[PDB]
């Protein structure tokens, strides 16, 4: 979706943009982890540092990363166009990601889509008439083990139902953050049946191990 720059100022360098010297010390740690000789490989962590500084990134962020990492910026434009984290459009504060591919659609994701729609109001893919409620549906996030899943900003949410969805949207309006895990009890990815897994606290290194 519009993979050319197409300026529209509040963009179009030099946009006013700069970091914190504390963040520059973070950058020194980041290019201290990597070996010298191939110093330019830290484009992805430095640009994600820019993304978590400013939730959307302008092009002057990419020019600043080119200044710090001394390479021509076209590599940075490649990386910014390539991946999926780097939301190059200006979006709002909180960010809804409704994951649905293979188990998630058959575990009633359309009720989840309709719940997000008829509570939030705005159509899918768009934003809201302020910030902080940008909605996208996405492909697999990895946590396939449960209900069609919700990622808000570095927070996973499983075992969904429309009443819990209304709870989550009400608590976003009140600002209080829910738990970082699923719902319907089961504090981790559990067999919700009758403890089919290991039960007992194990022995350890004590029994017969082959020379160890």
């Amino acid at each position: 979706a519009l993979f050319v720059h197409r300026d529209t100022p509040k963009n179009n360098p030099e946009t006013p943009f700069d970091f914190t010297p504390e963040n520059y010390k973070r950058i020194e740690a980041i290019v201290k982890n990597y070996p010298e000789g191939h110093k330019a490989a830290a484009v992805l962590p430095v640009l994600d540092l820019a993304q978590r500084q400013n939730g959307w990134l302008p092009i002057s962020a990419m020019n600043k990363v080119a200044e710090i990492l001394q390479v021509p910026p076209m590599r940075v434009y490649e990386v910014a166009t390539f991946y999926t984290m780097y939301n190059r459009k200006p979006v709002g504060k909180y960010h809804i990601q409704v994951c649905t591919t293979t188990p998630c659609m058959l575990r009633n994701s359309d009720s989840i889509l309709e719940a997000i729609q008829k509570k939030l109001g705005i159509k899918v893919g768009e934003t809201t008439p302020d910030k902080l409620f940008t909605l996208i549906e996405v492909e697999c996030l990895g946590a396939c083990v449960n209900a069609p899943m919700v990622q808000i900003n570095d927070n996973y949410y499983e075992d969904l139902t429309p009443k819990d969805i209304e709870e989550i949207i009400d608590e976003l309006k009140a600002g209080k953050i829910p738990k970082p895990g699923p719902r319907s009890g089961r504090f981790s990815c559990e067999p919700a049946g009758g403890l089919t897994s290991l039960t007992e606290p194990p022995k350890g290194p004590g029994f017969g191990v082959q020379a160890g």
């Binding site: 070996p35 010298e36 000789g37 504090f187 981790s188």
Partner: protein, 41 residues
């Protein structure tokens, strides 16, 4: 025992990873060099 001994990550804010990267940067072998410092230096 049937109790969630995690939730230490309950409130890890978005700079905790990078602060921890700064915390773990020292006591480390010197990240070996090879000739140039960059292919365009």
């Amino acid at each position: 025992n049937t109790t969630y001994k995690n939730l230490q990550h309950h409130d890890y804010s978005t700079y905790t990873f990078l602060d921890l990267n700064l915390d773990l940067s020292k006591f480390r072998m010197p990240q070996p060099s090879s000739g140039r410092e960059s292919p365009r230096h």
